[PDB]
Amino acid sequence: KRISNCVADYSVLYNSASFSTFKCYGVSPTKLNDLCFTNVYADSFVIRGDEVRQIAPGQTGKIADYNYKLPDDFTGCVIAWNSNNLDSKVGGNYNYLYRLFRKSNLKPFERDISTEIYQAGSTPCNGVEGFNCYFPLQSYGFQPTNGVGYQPYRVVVLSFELLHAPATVCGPKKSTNLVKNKCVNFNFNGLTGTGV
C-alpha cells in the first residue's frame, strides 16, 4: 500500500485500545503526527504468536531473513493485534503460506515469490518430491482453540520515506481548545489579530 495525496491523523489509530502490541522505533511515538514526511509505506501479512518478537532490526531467524528483512536504518512503525475469530476456523485453516528454505540472504524491502524447489544435495531433481529436494513453501498450523503463542496475528508495518520532495502525507495543524472573553491572540487565515 502507498499513501499519497492524502492527509490523516494518527490519534485515532492509537485510542482503539485493542492492539496486543505496538512497537515503533526511529521517532518518538508521541511526536510523529507533527513531523512531516513524503511517503507512507504499509504492508499487511499474518504471523504466528511466537514470531512477533522477530519483527525487529538486528537479529537472525527463519521469517525475518527469508520473507522480509529489516534494515538498520529502519524508521518503521509496526502494529499487530489478535483477530483470531475471523482469520481462523475449525477443521484447520491453512489458507496462508510461508517460505522456510532459501538459497541465500535477501536485501530488505524486497518480495520473494519464487516457487522453485530448493535443492539441498548436489544432484538435480527436475521437480520431484524425492531425495535432497524439498518444497520451500510450507503450510501453517492455525487453529482457534490454541493458546496465545501460536494464534494468527495481523501484523503491519508503517514506514516513512525522507527524500528531496515536499510533504505530501502528514499531520495537519491540530485543533486546540477554544477560549473566549479573554485577551488572546488568534489568526483565522488572514490576520494575526489580538483581542477578546
Partner: antibody
C-alpha cells in the same frame, strides 16, 4: 511443455460445469496453477490460483464461495467445478502457469497458457 | 475497473508506436512489475515480456517495456503483418488481492 484442454461445452442455466486441464510431459507437479477467463466485450479477469503441492486454494475477493477447483497428482490433471450458472457465462477459460522469481516487483507472470474451453449457456 | 486503456491507436508501417497504461498507486505505482500480453483473435495469448527487463525466448527484441513511475509504456518499431491483436496490462493489485487485466487496444487503420 504444452497444456491441452477440452472443446466447447454447453449446459443449462443452473447446472455445474465440468472441464479438465491436462498436462503433457512434466513440470506440472511443482508450479502453481491458476485459471484465466477472457470475455468478448470486456477485459480479462483472474478467478484464482491453486497450488498443487499443498492443495491450498487461493481465490480473489471479487468471487464468492461458489466455484471450487481441485488438483490431482496421480494423473497430473486439474478439474474445475462451477455451479449456479448465470446469463453472462458466454466466455472462454484458460489453464495458465505461474513462475515466481526474485526482485523488487515480484509480480505473477503467466508465461505458459492452455488452449481454451468455450463454455456458453443460454435458453 | 482499476486499469484503464485507450480504445484504439493509430500508426504507420515504419514509425514508432507507443502505448500508455495508467492505473492506481496501489497496483502499478506501488512497485509491482507489469506484464504485457497479446490477444490474437483465435489463438491463446502468450508471454511477451515480464518485468520489463528480461527477454523471453522466442520473442523478438523489437518490443521494449518501460515503467515511468506510476505509468508503464510499451514501444514498438515498425508494423508487420501480425499486430492485428489486442494489448493488455497485467499487474498485481493489492486492493483486489489478485491479478487484474487492462482494457485492450486495437491496432488497425484501414485495409
Amino acid at each position: 511443455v504444452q497444456l491441452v484442454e477440452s472443446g466447447a461445452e454447453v449446459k443449462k442455466p443452473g447446472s455445474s460445469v465440468k472441464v479438465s486441464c491436462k498436462a503433457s510431459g512434466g513440470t506440472f507437479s511443482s508450479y502453481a496453477i491458476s485459471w484465466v477467463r477472457q470475455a468478448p466485450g470486456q477485459g480479462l479477469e483472474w478467478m484464482g490460483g491453486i497450488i498443487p503441492i499443498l492443495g491450498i486454494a487461493n481465490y480473489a475477493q471479487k468471487f464468492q464461495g461458489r466455484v471450487t477447483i481441485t488438483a490431482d497428482k496421480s494423473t497430473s490433471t486439474a478439474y474445475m467445478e462451477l455451479s449456479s450458472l448465470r446469463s453472462e457465462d458466454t466466455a472462454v477459460y484458460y489453464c495458465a502457469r505461474e513462475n515466481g522469481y526474485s526482485g523488487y516487483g515480484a509480480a505473477a507472470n503467466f508465461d505458459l497458457w492452455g488452449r481454451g474451453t468455450l463454455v456458453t449457456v443460454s435458453s | 475497473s482499476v486499469l484503464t486503456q485507450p480504445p484504439s491507436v493509430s500508426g504507420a508501417p515504419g514509425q514508432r508506436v507507443t502505448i500508455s497504461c495508467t492505473g492506481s498507486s496501489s497496483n502499478i505505482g506501488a512497485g509491482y512489475d507489469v506484464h504485457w500480453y497479446q490477444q490474437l483473435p483465435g489463438t491463446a495469448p502468450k508471454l511477451l515480456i515480464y518485468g520489463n527487463s528480461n527477454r523471453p525466448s522466442g520473442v523478438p527484441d523489437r518490443f521494449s517495456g518501460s515503467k515511468s513511475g506510476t505509468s508503464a509504456s510499451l514501444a514498438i518499431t515498425g508494423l508487420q503483418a501480425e499486430d492485428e491483436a489486442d494489448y493488455y496490462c497485467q499487474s498485481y493489485d493489492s486492493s483486489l488481492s489478485g491479478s487484474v487485466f487492462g482494457g485492450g487496444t486495437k491496432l488497425t487503420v484501414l485495409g
